């Protein structure tokens, strides 16, 4: 977790809402919804998902690696949805494809709670 | 001040749907303060009238304009009645005037909401309901009434209003989103409506708990939710069932068949289960709900297919039936029956939506006078359009 936090300080991250306004509703999702989405992402892509949690489980970080670009989901029980890139954001299709899979996973989790 | 505390208590009672308690408290305060200023008595009378009007609106028995107009006139008279002969403090008088203005704005908003509800009840009898126009009108009304009663004294009333009105909006867009075959925004709107309904139910349960505490350990009747809340919950359930029926394939692709069937059985009505039962009983070859993608064979793909994938062989026959019987399908009430001797197939087509078509195809010669299939198609169309919920609202 410490290495991920240190690496995140030297990387460029953009929130999901910045790329597409329609995803901004995901920023208002509850902590339980965020945990359910993290569990769904871990179940769907265990090989590409990395989970880091604090000893008291207050802060949980879920990263879905693609490898220079990844989607990071951070939740503080005691939430954020941003895409982390090692270099500055380009002014590309693989990054959009990675976001589409995460968007579908978030959409799938939201639909489950409605039934 | 005592007047501010009384107003806060009345507003808190109103926000918990305790109109009778708020009216009784206002009447008691007015009776005990007969020697106070005339503005205070006018405000108390206006508050009692507004509580009665709110109770009537919650009961939804007006489906109200005269009562709202009288309340607005009383509030305007109280605001403009700057009578210093009552001995009230000038700060108290200014607070009363601001409260009267906020109450007049709230009364106008309530009158607009009642007019919208009456329009929806009138349009319930229409074969097709334009959800986009209703959503736009609701958004315009909300924007006009936005931040009009943001006073902290009116805090629980306004929170009780928007959380309901937005809920209605959360339904309206959903009614459009289901019509446009949009799954993600329909699901988001349904989740928002469910959250708003749960928020309203929290206040209802708080009021019920307060009533139970006041009534002791006796087996008192539970505080029933108002007719508006029940209608909103029924509309949300109907919209969720319609979305599940339309988006059955997407939900079922992520789970097993048994789990998908169990999930669909909870939705009221369960269109998928009824369709499967009808297919099993009548030995129907295929039942396909196809959404028209024109303007958004591939132009009319089968969104839902039972009990298997959509027969490709019957695709051009269904396309020809839809094209030739376009005028009949446009009525959204008639059912078109076709027979093909080359394939010896019987096709029954209905159009519950202008962009959705339900087709039942059987590999046998079926007479057009078979009332069972026509009745089933009519019931399915009525469930999909959902005019009964709006009629009962």
Swiss-Prot record, chain A:
Tissue specificity, please? Expressed in the brain, predominantly in the parietal and frontal cortex, as well as in dorsal root ganglia. Expressed in peripheral white blood cells.
Compartments annotated for it: namely:
Lysosome membrane; Peroxisome
Q: Which disease is it linked to?
A: Developmental and epileptic encephalopathy 18: A severe autosomal recessive neurologic disorder characterized by lack of psychomotor development apparent from birth, dysmorphic facial features, early onset of refractory seizures, and thick corpus callosum and persistent cavum septum pellucidum on brain imaging.
Outline what the protein does: As part of the KICSTOR complex functions in the amino acid-sensing branch of the TORC1 signaling pathway. Recruits, in an amino acid-independent manner, the GATOR1 complex to the lysosomal membranes and allows its interaction with GATOR2 and the RAG GTPases. Functions upstream of the RAG GTPases and is required to negatively regulate mTORC1 signaling in absence of amino acids. In absence of the KICSTOR complex mTORC1 is constitutively localized to the lysosome and activated. The KICSTOR complex is also probably involved in the regulation of mTORC1 by glucose.
| Assembly and binders | Part of the KICSTOR complex composed of KPTN, ITFG2, KICS2 and SZT2. SZT2 probably serves as a link between the other three proteins in the KICSTOR complex and mediates the direct interaction with the GATOR1 complex.
Listed name of the protein:
KICSTOR complex protein SZT2
Protein source organism: Homo sapiens
Q: What is the lineage of its organism?
A: Eukaryota, Metazoa, Chordata, Craniata, Vertebrata
Swiss-Prot record, chain B:
Keyword tags: Disease variant, Intellectual disability, Lysosome, Membrane
Q: Which GO terms describe its biological process?
A: cellular response to amino acid starvation; cellular response to glucose starvation; negative regulation of TORC1 signaling; protein localization to lysosome
Domain of life according to the entry: Eukaryota
- Which is one Pfam family of this protein? C12orf66_like
Which compartments does it reside in? Lysosome membrane
Q: Which SUPFAM superfamilies match?
A: FLJ32549 C-terminal domain-like, FLJ32549 domain-like
- A Gene Ontology term for the protein's cellular component: intercellular bridge
Question: Mainly localized where?
Answer: membrane
Q: Which family does it belong to?
A: Belongs to the KICS2 family.
From the record heading the sequence, give the disease linked to this protein. Intellectual developmental disorder, autosomal recessive 83: An autosomal recessive disorder characterized by developmental delay, mild to moderate intellectual disability, and poor or absent speech. Additional variable features include seizures, hearing impairment, hypotonia, and non-specific facial dysmorphism.
On subunit structure and binding partners, the annotation says: Part of the KICSTOR complex composed of KPTN, ITFG2, KICS2 and SZT2. SZT2 probably serves as a link between the other three proteins in the KICSTOR complex and may mediate the direct interaction with the GATOR complex via GATOR1. The KICSTOR complex interacts directly with the GATOR1 complex and most probably indirectly with the GATOR2 complex in an amino acid-independent manner.
* The protein's role, per its UniProt record: As part of the KICSTOR complex functions in the amino acid-sensing branch of the TORC1 signaling pathway. Recruits, in an amino acid-independent manner, the GATOR1 complex to the lysosomal membranes and allows its interaction with GATOR2 and the RAG GTPases. Functions upstream of the RAG GTPases and is required to negatively regulate mTORC1 signaling in absence of amino acids. In absence of the KICSTOR complex mTORC1 is constitutively localized to the lysosome and activated. The KICSTOR complex is also probably involved in the regulation of mTORC1 by glucose.
Q: What is this protein called?
A: KICSTOR subunit 2
Organism from which the protein derives: Homo sapiens (Human)
The encoding gene = KICS2
């Amino acid at each position: 977790l410490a290495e991920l936090e240190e690496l995140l300080e030297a990387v460029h991250a953009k929130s999901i809402g910045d790329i597409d306004p329609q995803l901004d509703c995901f920023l208002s999702m509850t902590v339980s919804w965020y945990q359910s989405l993290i569990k769904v992402l871990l179940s769907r892509f265990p090989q590409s998902c990395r989970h880091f949690q604090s000893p008291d489980l207050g802060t949980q970080y879920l990263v879905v690696l693609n490898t220079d670009c990844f989607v990071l989901v951070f939740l503080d029980s005691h939430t954020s949805l941003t895409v982390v890139f090692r270099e500055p954001f380009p002014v590309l299709v693989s990054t959009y494809h990675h976001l589409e899979s995460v968007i579908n996973t978030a959409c799938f989790t939201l639909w489950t709670r409605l039934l | 001040p005592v007047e501010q505390a009384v107003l806060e208590t009345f507003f808190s009672h109103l926000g918990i749907f305790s109109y009778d308690k708020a009216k009784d408290n206002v009447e008691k305060e007015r009776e005990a303060n007969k020697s106070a200023g005339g503005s205070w008595l006018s405000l108390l009378a206006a508050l009692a009238h507004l509580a009665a009007a709110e109770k009537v609106y919650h009961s939804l028995t007006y489906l109200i304009r005269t009562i709202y107009t009288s309340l607005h006139n009383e509030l305007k008279k109280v605001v403009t009645g700057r009578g210093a002969l009552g001995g009230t403090a000038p700060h108290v008088e200014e607070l009363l005037s601001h409260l009267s203005e906020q109450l007049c704005f709230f009364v106008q908003a309530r009158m607009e909401i009642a007019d919208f509800y009456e329009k929806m009840y009138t349009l319930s009898t229409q074969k097709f309901i334009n959800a986009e126009e209703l959503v736009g009108l609701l958004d315009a009304i909300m924007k006009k009434y936005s931040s009009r009663f943001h006073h902290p004294i009116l805090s629980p009333l306004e929170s009780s209003f928007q959380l309901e009105v937005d809920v209605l909006c959360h339904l309206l867009k959903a009614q459009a989103q289901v019509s446009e075959w949009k799954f993600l925004p329909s699901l988001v709107n349904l989740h928002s409506a469910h959250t708003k309904l749960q928020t309203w139910g929290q206040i209802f349960e708080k009021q019920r708990e307060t009533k139970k505490h006041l009534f002791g350990g006796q087996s008192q009747k539970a505080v029933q939710p108002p007719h508006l809340f029940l209608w909103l919950m029924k509309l949300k359930n109907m919209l969720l069932a319609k979305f599940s029926f339309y988006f059955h394939e997407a939900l079922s692709r992520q789970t097993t068949a048994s789990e998908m069937k169990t999930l669909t059985a909870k939705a009221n009505p369960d269109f998928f289960g009824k369709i499967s039962s009808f297919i099993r009983k009548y030995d129907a070859a295929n039942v396909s709900l196809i959404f028209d993608n024109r303007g958004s064979v591939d132009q009319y793909p089968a969104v839902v297919s039972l009990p298997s994938d959509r027969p490709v062989m019957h695709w051009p026959n269904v396309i020809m039936i839809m094209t030739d019987r376009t005028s009949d399908l446009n009525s959204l009430e008639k059912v078109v029956h076709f027979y093909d001797d080359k394939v010896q197939s019987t096709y029954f087509l209905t159009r519950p939506e202008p962009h959705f078509t339900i087709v039942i195809i059987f590999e046998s010669k079926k007479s057009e006078r078979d009332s069972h299939f026509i009745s089933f198609l009519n019931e399915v169309s009525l469930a999909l359009k959902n005019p009964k919920v709006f009629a009962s609202l």
